[model samples]
Target: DDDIRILGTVGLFESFTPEQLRLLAFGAERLVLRAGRELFREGQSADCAYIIVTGTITLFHEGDEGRVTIRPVGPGAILGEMALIAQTTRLTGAVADVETEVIRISRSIFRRILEE
Candidate 1:
């Protein structure tokens, strides 16, 4: 129920019915990111996508210039969405700018929902 409410606030889930959201919520994993900890590294093979439920996560890209961009995202933001449907690696590395709560939705669960 709490997860469904959180999902309702995200634009990506706007078109999903409550039932669909419930299904996703049931299968998803809730995680906590301690401040200053890394979530995912760039170039890591991704099997799931993360949705920020609370606090902030910092995302950055590395190039010849090194750490080219530092982007911060808060609640309602979804990261690595493409990984939910495709075989891909993370493009940016993520770090928790603060204590953060996130919902991790794995690719298998997403694909199952799509088939329903």
Candidate 2:
């Protein structure tokens, strides 16, 4: 049931081959973030993408007065894609809205998985 479990956790898994899925699980590292924690800040260099495994997070961009909410992402959602893909700084900041768990996949591992 490992495949089934993985599929349920990520939308991209639907298109993944068995080997790819296995590699993804193997490359992923579980992360725990507390509520109100800033997972990443805008303008920082990002080296990894995260897949939400539990709870919720909020993405926002800095505005005139303060942060403006871009969206709320929950379980199965992916974040930091733009940074990892473009090798640029984060455009927005992400904060944990609740205690959360995520699977962290480093850029190198992501590239390796795609190469296969």
Q: What TM-score against the true fold does each predicted structure earn?
A: 0.83, 0.78
Candidate 1 global TM-score? 0.83
Q: For each candidate, what is the lDDT?
A: 0.85, 0.78
Task: Enumerate residue pairs that collide in model 1.
Answer: none
- Please provide, for model 2 over 1-116, each residue's C-alpha lDDT reduced to its tens digit, 9 standing for 90 to 100: 34236434555445767788778778778789999999898899998878887899999998899789999998778787654455768878999989998888787776687778
lDDT of 1 by residue, 14-101 (tens): 7888888988898889999899988889999999889888999989987796775578998878898888768789988999979999
Residue pair clashes in candidate 2: none
- Whose lDDT is greatest here? 1
Worst 10 residues of 2 by lDDT: 1-10
Question: Candidate 1, which segments miss by more than 4 Å at Cα?
Answer: 5-15, 63-68
